[PDB]
C-alpha cells in the first residue's frame, strides 16, 4: 500500500477520527518505529477531526514516550484532539501545510449521559479534569499560560496554519517544494 511505503519511511498517519480503534493503531505504529530506529524521527501526518480524550491521551503519551522525536504535520485539519496531538510533536518540528485548519476547543460530551446528580457531579469533575488536562497539555507545548488556553478554547478557535504558528501549535508553516 502507499501507507506501507509511508510507514517504511517512518511516517505514521493519523488520518481518521481519534477513537479507541485509531488510537490503538497509532500506538502500535509508534512503538514499532521506536523499536526499528529509536534515534530516527517518526513523522506523524494529521488530517483528523479529533474527538476522544482518552484516545487523545493514549496517542499523546505514546508519542511523548518514544525516544524518537515526533514530527507532526497537519494536512488539512487538526481539530480538537488532533490539534493537541499536532502541538504534541517535538519543538523545532511540528509542521503544517499552508491551508491546514487547526481547531482547538474545550472537551465536550457527545450526547447526554444520564444519571443521579452524584453521578453527574463526577462526570462533570471529570470533564473539568479533561478540560484542565487539555489546557495543561496545550500549554507546555505552545508556551501559553493555560489560562490563555482556557480563554481561547472557550469556543471553537479555528487557527490558520500561519496563525497556529503564532499560537504555538506548530513551529513552521510548510513551504511548498515546487510553486506549481
Amino acid at each position: 500500500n502507499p501507507y506501507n511505503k509511508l510507514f517504511e519511511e517512518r511516517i505514521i498517519f493519523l488520518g481518521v477520527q481519534v477513537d479507541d480503534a485509531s488510537a490503538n493503531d497509532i500506538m502500535a505504529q509508534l512503538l514499532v518505529l521506536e523499536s526499528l530506529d529509536p534515534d530516527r524521527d517518526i513523522t506523524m501526518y494529521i488530517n483528523s477531526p479529533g474527538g476522544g480524550f482518552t484516545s487523545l491521551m493514549a496517542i499523546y503519551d505514546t508519542m511523548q514516550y518514544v525516544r524518537a522525536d515526533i514530527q507532526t504535520v497537519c494536512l488539512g485539519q487538526a481539530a480538537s484532539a488532533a490539534a493537541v496531538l499536532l502541538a504534541a510533536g517535538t519543538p523545532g518540528k511540528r509542521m503544517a501545510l499552508p491551508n491546514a485548519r487547526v481547531l482547538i476547543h474545550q472537551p465536550s460530551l457527545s450526547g447526554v449521559i444520564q444519571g443521579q446528580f452524584s453521578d453527574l457531579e463526577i462526570q462533570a469533575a471529570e470533564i473539568e479534569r479533561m478540560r484542565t488536562l487539555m489546557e495543561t497539555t496545550l500549554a507546555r507545548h505552545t508556551g501559553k499560560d493555560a489560562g490563555v488556553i482556557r480563554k481561547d478554547t472557550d469556543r471553537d478557535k479555528i487557527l490558520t496554519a500561519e496563525e497556529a504558528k503564532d499560537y504555538g501549535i506548530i513551529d513552521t508553516v510548510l513551504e511548498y517544494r515546487k510553486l506549481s
Partner: protein, 219 residues
Amino acid sequence: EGGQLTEKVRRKPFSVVLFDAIEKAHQEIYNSLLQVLEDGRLTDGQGRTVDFKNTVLIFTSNLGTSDISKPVGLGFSKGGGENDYERMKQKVNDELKKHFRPEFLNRIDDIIVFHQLTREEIIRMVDLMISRVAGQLKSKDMALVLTDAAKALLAKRGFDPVLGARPLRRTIQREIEDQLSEKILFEEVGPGQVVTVDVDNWDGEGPGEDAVFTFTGTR
C-alpha cells in the same frame, strides 16, 4: 593433519580454548563440541581421543546484543541503567536458547552475559589504551604523558554506552595517535616527553568537541 583444534590441545592439554564468535559457526559444529564439554573428548579423524579435561573452553557470542545494543525496547517499561542490563540478560539468554540446542547450553558451566562499559570504566580504559601507545613510544626514546584533563576528553568522546572501548580505541587513534604520528614524522616530538594537554579545556565538563589536544615534547 589431525585438525586445527585437536592438535593444539593434544600438544598443550592445559590450555584456554577460545571459540570466538560462536554463533557465526554452523549449528552442526556445536554438535561436534557437545562431548568436548561433557566428556572432555574430541576424537579426531585419525581416531586419537584428545584430552579437553584440562582446557578452559571459552565460547564468545554477540547473540542478543547484535541488535538489542541499540537503546530503547519495543514497548513500555520501567528503569534504565541497570534494568537495561536485566533486559540485556533476558535478551541474550533467550537468543542463546533460540540459537543453541538446549543440550549445548546444559553443558556450559557458566554463561556470563557481559555488562556494557560504564562511563567510569571507559575512564580506566583510557589508562589501559594510552599505555599501549606510550609503550610503543618507549621504543622511540620517547615518553607519553597524558594529562588528566586529556584523559577525561578521550573518555567522553570515546564513550558509546552500547559499544564500549572499541569506539574509545578509535578516538585514541584519531586524536592521539593520528595526530602524534605526524608529529613524529615532522620530527617535532622526537625522543622527548609528549605531554598531550587539552587547550579549549572543554571547561572540563559539558561537550568538549570544540576542544583540541596539543602535543609538546620537553626534556
